[PDB]
Design an enzyme around this catalytic site. Sequence first.
Site, PDB file in Angstrom:
ATOM      1  N   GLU A 191     -15.394  94.929  30.524  1.00 44.39           N
ATOM      2  CA  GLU A 191     -15.469  95.932  31.571  1.00 44.39           C
ATOM      3  C   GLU A 191     -16.139  95.311  32.789  1.00 44.39           C
ATOM      4  O   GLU A 191     -15.616  95.400  33.899  1.00 44.39           O
ATOM      5  CB  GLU A 191     -16.261  97.150  31.094  1.00 44.39           C
ATOM      6  CG  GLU A 191     -16.182  98.346  32.029  1.00 44.39           C
ATOM      7  CD  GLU A 191     -17.519  98.682  32.658  1.00 44.39           C
ATOM      8  OE1 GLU A 191     -18.551  98.180  32.168  1.00 44.39           O
ATOM      9  OE2 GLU A 191     -17.537  99.450  33.644  1.00 44.39           O
ATOM     10  N   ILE A 221     -24.255 130.496  18.115  1.00 43.44           N
ATOM     11  CA  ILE A 221     -25.441 129.854  17.545  1.00 43.44           C
ATOM     12  C   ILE A 221     -26.393 129.408  18.646  1.00 43.44           C
ATOM     13  O   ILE A 221     -27.616 129.597  18.548  1.00 43.44           O
ATOM     14  CB  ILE A 221     -25.036 128.678  16.646  1.00 43.44           C
ATOM     15  CG1 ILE A 221     -24.280 129.212  15.435  1.00 43.44           C
ATOM     16  CG2 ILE A 221     -26.268 127.917  16.228  1.00 43.44           C
ATOM     17  CD1 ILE A 221     -23.824 128.170  14.487  1.00 43.44           C
ATOM     18  N   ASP A 235     -17.367 112.146  56.229  1.00 47.64           N
ATOM     19  CA  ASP A 235     -16.688 112.688  55.060  1.00 47.64           C
ATOM     20  C   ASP A 235     -17.062 114.157  54.949  1.00 47.64           C
ATOM     21  O   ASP A 235     -18.216 114.482  54.664  1.00 47.64           O
ATOM     22  CB  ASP A 235     -17.084 111.919  53.791  1.00 47.64           C
ATOM     23  CG  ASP A 235     -16.111 112.134  52.625  1.00 47.64           C
ATOM     24  OD1 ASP A 235     -14.991 112.662  52.849  1.00 47.64           O
ATOM     25  OD2 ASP A 235     -16.468 111.754  51.480  1.00 47.64           O
ATOM     26  N   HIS A 289     -26.913 130.665  21.537  1.00 47.22           N
ATOM     27  CA  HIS A 289     -27.056 131.669  22.567  1.00 47.22           C
ATOM     28  C   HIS A 289     -28.556 131.885  22.790  1.00 47.22           C
ATOM     29  O   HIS A 289     -29.369 131.653  21.885  1.00 47.22           O
ATOM     30  CB  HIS A 289     -26.326 132.933  22.122  1.00 47.22           C
ATOM     31  CG  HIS A 289     -26.039 133.896  23.224  1.00 47.22           C
ATOM     32  ND1 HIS A 289     -26.953 134.815  23.685  1.00 47.22           N
ATOM     33  CD2 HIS A 289     -24.898 134.119  23.919  1.00 47.22           C
ATOM     34  CE1 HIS A 289     -26.401 135.530  24.649  1.00 47.22           C
ATOM     35  NE2 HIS A 289     -25.153 135.128  24.811  1.00 47.22           N
ATOM     36  N   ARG A 338     -15.008 115.924  44.212  1.00 48.52           N
ATOM     37  CA  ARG A 338     -15.028 114.703  45.009  1.00 48.52           C
ATOM     38  C   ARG A 338     -13.856 113.910  44.409  1.00 48.52           C
ATOM     39  O   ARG A 338     -13.677 113.898  43.187  1.00 48.52           O
ATOM     40  CB  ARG A 338     -16.342 113.949  44.825  1.00 48.52           C
ATOM     41  CG  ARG A 338     -17.530 114.594  45.518  1.00 48.52           C
ATOM     42  CD  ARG A 338     -18.809 113.813  45.263  1.00 48.52           C
ATOM     43  NE  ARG A 338     -20.000 114.627  45.483  1.00 48.52           N
ATOM     44  CZ  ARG A 338     -20.416 115.034  46.679  1.00 48.52           C
ATOM     45  NH1 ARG A 338     -19.735 114.703  47.768  1.00 48.52           N
ATOM     46  NH2 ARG A 338     -21.513 115.772  46.787  1.00 48.52           N
ATOM     47  N   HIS A 366     -17.342  96.282  26.368  1.00 46.56           N
ATOM     48  CA  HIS A 366     -18.246  96.563  27.466  1.00 46.56           C
ATOM     49  C   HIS A 366     -18.319  95.377  28.414  1.00 46.56           C
ATOM     50  O   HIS A 366     -18.121  95.515  29.624  1.00 46.56           O
ATOM     51  CB  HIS A 366     -19.598  96.909  26.863  1.00 46.56           C
ATOM     52  CG  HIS A 366     -20.655  97.182  27.867  1.00 46.56           C
ATOM     53  ND1 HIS A 366     -21.983  96.898  27.635  1.00 46.56           N
ATOM     54  CD2 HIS A 366     -20.587  97.701  29.110  1.00 46.56           C
ATOM     55  CE1 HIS A 366     -22.691  97.243  28.693  1.00 46.56           C
ATOM     56  NE2 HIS A 366     -21.867  97.736  29.597  1.00 46.56           N
TER      57      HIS A 366
HETATM   58  O1  LIG Z   1     -22.540  99.113  33.454  1.00 49.12           O
HETATM   59  C1  LIG Z   1     -21.582  99.686  33.850  1.00 49.12           C
HETATM   60  C2  LIG Z   1     -21.517 100.084  35.329  1.00 49.12           C
HETATM   61  C3  LIG Z   1     -21.415  98.894  36.276  1.00 49.12           C
HETATM   62  C4  LIG Z   1     -19.976  98.664  36.732  1.00 49.12           C
HETATM   63  C5  LIG Z   1     -19.880  97.295  37.398  1.00 49.12           C
HETATM   64  C6  LIG Z   1     -19.976  96.142  36.611  1.00 49.12           C
HETATM   65  C7  LIG Z   1     -19.899  94.881  37.184  1.00 49.12           C
HETATM   66  C8  LIG Z   1     -19.722  94.767  38.594  1.00 49.12           C
HETATM   67  C9  LIG Z   1     -19.648  93.471  39.189  1.00 49.12           C
HETATM   68  C10 LIG Z   1     -19.477  93.364  40.564  1.00 49.12           C
HETATM   69  C11 LIG Z   1     -19.389  94.516  41.355  1.00 49.12           C
HETATM   70  C12 LIG Z   1     -19.463  95.779  40.783  1.00 49.12           C
HETATM   71  C13 LIG Z   1     -19.633  95.897  39.368  1.00 49.12           C
HETATM   72  C14 LIG Z   1     -19.719  97.196  38.772  1.00 49.12           C
HETATM   73  N1  LIG Z   1     -22.252  99.050  37.454  1.00 49.12           N
HETATM   74  C15 LIG Z   1     -22.109  99.974  38.409  1.00 49.12           C
HETATM   75  C16 LIG Z   1     -23.159  99.708  39.360  1.00 49.12           C
HETATM   76  C17 LIG Z   1     -23.492 100.469  40.661  1.00 49.12           C
HETATM   77  C18 LIG Z   1     -23.270 101.959  40.586  1.00 49.12           C
HETATM   78  O2  LIG Z   1     -21.951 102.311  40.958  1.00 49.12           O
HETATM   79  C19 LIG Z   1     -21.401 101.647  42.095  1.00 49.12           C
HETATM   80  C20 LIG Z   1     -21.574 100.134  42.027  1.00 49.12           C
HETATM   81  N2  LIG Z   1     -22.963  99.880  41.842  1.00 49.12           N
HETATM   82  C21 LIG Z   1     -23.810  99.139  42.733  1.00 49.12           C
HETATM   83  O3  LIG Z   1     -24.958  99.032  42.459  1.00 49.12           O
HETATM   84  C22 LIG Z   1     -23.227  98.525  44.006  1.00 49.12           C
HETATM   85  C23 LIG Z   1     -23.806  98.900  45.198  1.00 49.12           C
HETATM   86  C24 LIG Z   1     -23.330  98.386  46.381  1.00 49.12           C
HETATM   87  C25 LIG Z   1     -22.275  97.489  46.352  1.00 49.12           C
HETATM   88  F1  LIG Z   1     -21.839  97.005  47.549  1.00 49.12           F
HETATM   89  C26 LIG Z   1     -21.686  97.103  45.149  1.00 49.12           C
HETATM   90  F2  LIG Z   1     -20.637  96.229  45.123  1.00 49.12           F
HETATM   91  C27 LIG Z   1     -22.167  97.625  43.962  1.00 49.12           C
HETATM   92  N3  LIG Z   1     -23.823  98.655  38.895  1.00 49.12           N
HETATM   93  N4  LIG Z   1     -23.265  98.271  37.767  1.00 49.12           N
HETATM   94  N5  LIG Z   1     -20.469 100.034  32.958  1.00 49.12           N
HETATM   95  O4  LIG Z   1     -20.396  99.738  31.577  1.00 49.12           O
HETATM   96 ZN   LIG Z   2     -22.399  97.971  31.743  1.00 45.79          ZN
END
Ligand SMILES: O=C(C[C@@H](Cc1ccc2ccccc2c1)n1cc([C@@H]2COCCN2C(=O)c2ccc(F)c(F)c2)nn1)NO
Ligand SMILES: [Zn+2]
EC number: 3.4.24.56
Lengths: 957, 958
Positions: free
Chosen positions: B73, B300, B857, B302, B391, B70
Amino acid sequence: NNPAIKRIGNHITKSPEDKREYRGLELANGIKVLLISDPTTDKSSAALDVHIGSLSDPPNIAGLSHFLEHMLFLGTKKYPKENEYSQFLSEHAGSSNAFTSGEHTNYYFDVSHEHLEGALDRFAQFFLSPLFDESAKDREVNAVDSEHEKNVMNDAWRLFQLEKATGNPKHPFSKFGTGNKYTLETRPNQEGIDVRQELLKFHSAYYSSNLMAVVVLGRESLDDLTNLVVKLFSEVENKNVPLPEFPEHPFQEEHLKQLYKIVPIKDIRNLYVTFPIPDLQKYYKSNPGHYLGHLIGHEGPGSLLSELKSKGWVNTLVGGQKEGARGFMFFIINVDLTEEGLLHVEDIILHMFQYIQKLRAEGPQEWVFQELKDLNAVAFRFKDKERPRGYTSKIAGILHYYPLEEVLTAEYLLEEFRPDLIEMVLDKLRPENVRVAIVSKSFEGKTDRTEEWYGTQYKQEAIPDEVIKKWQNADLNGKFKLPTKNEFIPTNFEILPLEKEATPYPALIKDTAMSKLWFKQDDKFFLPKANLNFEFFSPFAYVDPLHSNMAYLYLELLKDSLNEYAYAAELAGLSYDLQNTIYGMYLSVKGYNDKQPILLKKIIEKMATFEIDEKRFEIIKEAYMRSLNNFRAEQPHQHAMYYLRLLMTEVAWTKDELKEALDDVTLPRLKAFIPQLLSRLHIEALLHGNITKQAALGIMQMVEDTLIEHAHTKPLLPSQLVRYREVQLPDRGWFVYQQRNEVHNNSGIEIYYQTDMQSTSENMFLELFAQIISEPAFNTLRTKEQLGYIVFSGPRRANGIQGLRFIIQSEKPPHYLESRVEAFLITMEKSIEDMTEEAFQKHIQALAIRRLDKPKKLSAESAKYWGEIISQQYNFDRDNTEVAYLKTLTKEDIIKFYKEMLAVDAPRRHKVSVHVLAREMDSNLSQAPALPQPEVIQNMTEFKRGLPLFPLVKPHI
Amino acid sequence: GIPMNNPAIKRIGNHITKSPEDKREYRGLELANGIKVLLISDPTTDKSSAALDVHIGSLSDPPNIAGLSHFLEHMLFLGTKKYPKENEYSQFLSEHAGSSNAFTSGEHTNYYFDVSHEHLEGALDRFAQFFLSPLFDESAKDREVNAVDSEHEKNVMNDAWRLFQLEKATGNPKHPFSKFGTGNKYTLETRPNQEGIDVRQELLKFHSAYYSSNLMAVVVLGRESLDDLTNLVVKLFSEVENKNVPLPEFPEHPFQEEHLKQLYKIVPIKDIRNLYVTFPIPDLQKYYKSNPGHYLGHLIGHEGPGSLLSELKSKGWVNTLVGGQKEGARGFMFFIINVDLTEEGLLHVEDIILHMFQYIQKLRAEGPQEWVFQELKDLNAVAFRFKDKERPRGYTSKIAGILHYYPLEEVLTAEYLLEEFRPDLIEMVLDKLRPENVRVAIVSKSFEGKTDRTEEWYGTQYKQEAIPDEVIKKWQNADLNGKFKLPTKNEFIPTNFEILPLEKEATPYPALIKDTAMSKLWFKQDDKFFLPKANLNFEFFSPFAYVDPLHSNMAYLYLELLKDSLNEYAYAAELAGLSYDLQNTIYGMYLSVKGYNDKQPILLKKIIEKMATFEIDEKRFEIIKEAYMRSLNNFRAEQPHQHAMYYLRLLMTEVAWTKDELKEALDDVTLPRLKAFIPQLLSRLHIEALLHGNITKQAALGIMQMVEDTLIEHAHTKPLLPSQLVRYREVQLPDRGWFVYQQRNEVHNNSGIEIYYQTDMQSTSENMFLELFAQIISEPAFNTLRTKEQLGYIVFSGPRRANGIQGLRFIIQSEKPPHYLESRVEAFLITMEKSIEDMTEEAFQKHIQALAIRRLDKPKKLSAESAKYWGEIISQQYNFDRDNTEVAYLKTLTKEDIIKFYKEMLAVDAPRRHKVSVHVLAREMNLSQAPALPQPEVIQNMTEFKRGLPLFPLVKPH
Ligand SMILES: O=C(C[C@@H](Cc1ccc2ccccc2c1)n1cc([C@@H]2COCCN2C(=O)c2ccc(F)c(F)c2)nn1)NO
Ligand SMILES: [Zn+2]
Ligand SMILES: O=C(C[C@@H](Cc1ccc2ccccc2c1)n1cc([C@@H]2COCCN2C(=O)c2ccc(F)c(F)c2)nn1)NO
Ligand SMILES: [Zn+2]
């Protein structure tokens, strides 16, 4: 002693609770005078009554005496500035008025107590040396014509005059008394009469000191007042005019047993029964006519009304003696009609004669008369203290009828049963002396006659002799029975001692989710009376037109139910008002602080456990329907103010909306509505008078407990107790809304300059400006330009916001009226800036005197506090603090405020205008300014949606 | 002649089977390094998209470092060797109308983005480096571990996460299924420091051990040809190295015999009552062409006549049931039957479970039903034939996961089409559903006090018991029960798929084809998608739906009771692609009917008739009112930031009843009172409807009149007056004002904050000032407030719109106190002022084009087009051309325009600054320079706050 004084009265009998001092006296020239010394009064006052009136008009000049009445205001030899009288009063916190009846012309004024002499001098000149300026005469004929016009389509006037026109044509009683431009200008010019000659001629012939009575009230000692009155009034010339007498009754025998069918403007259904009778004024000591009126017009059990109502025929009844003139009077019984009633006029009248016949069978009842005597006596002992202006005008009128030492009591006390006179009058109430008139739109097209002056459409036929005979044989009806002893007569007149922690202003002595209870023990008037004011708040009172109709009907039906029981209390000085409002229900109980808890509990119990009588429901609903429709026949300036109130408030249901929702109110739906309305409530109350804090809490508690036990009332949430806001107009905006009045052939206009939210500074800017422009406004737009009879300028206060407003009813189109008000404002800009500093301060003091005038009776002080409470501001000391700020305002402050808020060029101008077009209407002088294009309101909902809503004021505490 | 074999491509698939309505073109192929690839060419798409799914996830966490998968990730977003700016990837997407996300399951880590179709390659190149050259910067790793901690903290007091990990913790402790996958600051930093682990090596080690090309599937969707998409993917991904990692398998179930016939008693955070019955079953994935699991799940679980749920609801024991197969991992699955519990139900769990086993017995008695299988096949087939267009972001992400499980040519169809009737498999699975295999869990506050165990990651309070063998035996001897009948043929299955021809008078936007006192009908015959479907939207206005708390409660219960009685009837329609929504609003009621237009008028008539003639069952009334009482109370356990937003709506709307006011009022809702309310609400109405799809003008007018005629006949409805159709206004804040409203969240140990900078009524002018500014700051605000300062996991900026008004808002959930967050947001606004001033005109026009792409879009499916219109309609702005208009105007704005706007409305010293803040305190409550802030006016009472301020106008309709 003094030559100018023929006699000087002795003790002028008064109430022991009356602290004012009285001296009667008769001048050498015959002028009967009463002098009232009240060292406390904030305004002094004089009134004069000339015992001549419309009945004495020349036959060729209908309305002369009325016209002369107007003309006296427009200048005298000694004070020839046309607006000098009105301008002096306006600059010294005064006002005046006058009216012309059949045998009286009555003039009165009040003024700051420190300026009695200056006012009274100017006043005296009306009766010494009026100018009767030709120019002023040609102008003010229009104010009379406009005054007549507003009345032309008014059903009460039309009938009033039509009675006169169905009597003997040769009798003065038949004269058209108001006059109009035709009778005061056009026909006299065609006939070669010089009108000004005739005003002078009349004035010199009839305004004689032997036909005058004068009453003066001021702070000065009775002695100083005696000197002041002799100074100014012994000058009046006495031409020993004989008091006119009308011995011959206007209805002779060919005018009896007649039936009249009449078609009024409004949809109304009335039955008028009239008996000619001899003049009873002399018998005033006993008052046979009042004794008989009391019984015939009784509304309690066994009464004539009671049975007519339970037969479904009538809703209201009036009965008693009606004034005529020295020589003749009338006895009347007047009922309104249900749809059934209209089909049963023969039987309604039969029932009338049945009740008369029972009064003949039982013969006079001394205990009845004695009950009236002792109640009237108590009434007089504890009479509230009158305001000067009305008191002087009232007394000045009756001085002609009673000796000096009894003028204050002659109209309250009674002396001996004198059953012979009762039987004598009762003998005139017989089918062969009856006149009957029915008013219903159902006679439309079925009439054959037109009344000259008003145009009224009617028909006259003789009552078939067979029908007279049936009425003559009226049997006794077991449903009619004399009244019972009044059970509400008060007996404990003790004034409770001031509690040691009593308050000068109402104190919040309880504050639950259910109740806010404001309490003050009376510390000024010390009469055995109390005022109980309750505001029942519930959102379901006004949520939509259907619910709004059901609140009305509920309270109407409830009061209809209580009427029989509560009539007695009303006769014994204990009354109540039950009213629906846009926030819920308003209940008021005023009167002797003795039996009040009995009535109050009876009302709250009947509210909470009401059982609707289906026939009552049908009858009152139908009435309400007609009520709503009949608004079409209101007056243009009325319509104007109504539309403006609809435009500027958050929520507001129109008559059409209510009227469409009405068909959907069904007895079931109403039955469901009431417990829902009552289910949750907030009660805000003011209890003021001869009651202790303990007693107040116990009254409040009894109200809560009765609602909780019988209707399961739960409190409301704080968040639900919201008041409506007023629309917030845009800077430099000007909106116009246009409607037509389909009944009156004048137009109306209200113009509103919304300023800002109420506050001590904004309140006093607006109040000072209104004061400075008040008289100028009347003088310029009525007296000089004669736009119409109704011309009004003042403040407007609604929903915590305020502004300046002009109201005018005219024959001119409203857009003309707009430029004329705009022109006037500019000329006021010049006048304020040319205004001397000494004049400015005169206006400041005049306003201070008005604001600080103290209340003279419990009800007045009560209503001052209730205004603070319902308005949610709670500023009970407002007058002191606001007057104090007032005194510090400069003439430049006011000029800045005008140029910022009001001027045509003001940056924060907030102008909305309602135009009501007359029936037949279409869609040198100081120069009117140029006006922007108005944005035209087509839809009130769209208008409101596109603007913001003001805040609400913050409470004081 | 044989072909010229490109050596980067191990093989190119045959025809990818697709819906005949699907106009996208597809190619599958496998790279030389074993990456499985699907290419989607769609020359109309405004956004392109790619996704990569690695078949590794948190079941392969190292045992000593919980949550590494995680955490990795998160770390891949934070910089690569070729693109080492920590926020290059996020920044590039933001500036090109893009977004991305990723998630980590037990066996997959899935990464996806979607941007402007012109910048596919740029995005894809930055994307590819994730799987080649992550930096795993040591400073970055120290910061981002906070984000993961705050993500876990988000979940700690959430009953669904508690239960999810509790199950893992009651099985075989040595099985990977028992691992904690999220990770947090302890397991990812604190402990590894105590134990001397170097986390950056463990990351590099893991990435290199498992991010092998042979465990990777990618999907790329773009306007580009299929050939060009191939060259591109070969170019960017051929260099991913193949370490030939074997795919993890878990052949032993995590629930062994000593974990069966167990009972667990669990204490929830919210007041809820649930029963969870679980049976372990074999891994059924391989049988996907028959789906024995779903056959049994279908029966089951239903909800129609004769069903298991049906009877359990008549006994007054349960209100909802869910049954079917539940994913586990390669080598095991579960089969579940879950129900919620009434108060009685909680006392009859034993009989509930017995009834479950009676129904299961009925299934054994009747044996497999080819005709049922038939129904399943046919419905699925139709569903796929007329599948809405997705999408692209979600579509690439879905397909990228399932490439691991199906032949290339079947990725699109594998999950829809059934081919094989396998009664043997049905009997096999059904034989695993027996009391000797069952696990039972009960969740009730009533076990509060009586527990003796504590789950270690969430704190869950529970007790474990063996099911008495006498109970197991009574369940074994479950004889048949005559209330349980199999379902009957689904008569809601649609058969008329004909697409009516496009009428001559038809319009590009919805047209007002009926305007009466009663109803205002908007209509549009579909001109884009041509599937046999329609959406029918109705807004019913009544002033009595929200007049006070009591009535609001009654409007809710009325519709809840109504939906409850329609449920058995409407279920068959749900399964047949025809669904409906019914829910109270602050203006009255909202009804939506969506799906295959064929049989809609039947379902709609049933709904409207049953509204107008409703007969409340006292027993359902009591049960639903109790559940509603619990639902109100349970609000106390939502997230801090949810509370912040809730309180803001309360503060800024004219009328608004709080949970507490609703709850106090609920007790005075009696059956008789509700029976009275029903007809009162229906007595005067205004209906505004959008009917959009495969229907003609006549059919639409008929539908509308049928709804009117029904209400008129049965409930005697009359129209409302125009003056009654009032909307609520927004509180108008004073220039330079700043109010704060403070509250505490008594469940969660984070705080929350929403900050609202009100601007002015919506207009073309104002809308685009705010939207462009919010675009410019979108990415930087995330990167500063979260990635750099790590205030929390939940960090949000963007426009707020309500009641025709608008403004800018920030929402943050954090362990730090609101006032700190205020200063750091304020600091951030200052830095953005300088950032905009220093931005090049091309960089500015670039943000303009980004917003333009997003606003234009074009919707892909009918429901999304419908939604766009419906918003114009209930907002009573009726501005159907708004996108063309507002983008036009956008394109003319200058960076001076935006700096003027910011200095007038937003900057800390702005003359027209309208700031309200909601502070939600936690259960227990260098860096750039924050400006100093005025003393805030503290709102102690919402009613008085609102009474003392003006109310805005409402927006003028178009
Ligand atoms: O936890 C998770 C999910 C995790 C994934 C992640 C993890 C680390 C990151 C580090 C930097 C940038 C994005 C990173 C993304 N995640 C998604 C979001 C939201 C919702 O989806 C879109 C992104 N996002 C934002 O808020 C957001 C909004 C505006 C921006 F300009 C931007 F760059 C990000 N937050 N965390 N997986 O295990
Ligand atoms: Zn996460
Ligand atoms: O018609 C009637 C009544 C008639 C009498 C009359 C007639 C002519 C007048 C000429 C000049 C001044 C006052 C004249 C008065 N009347 C009363 C009013 C009202 C209401 O009571 C008070 C006065 N008043 C005003 O409007 C008013 C308001 C503010 C002022 F500054 C002002 F000077 C006058 N209007 N006409 N009897 O038969
Ligand atoms: Zn007059």
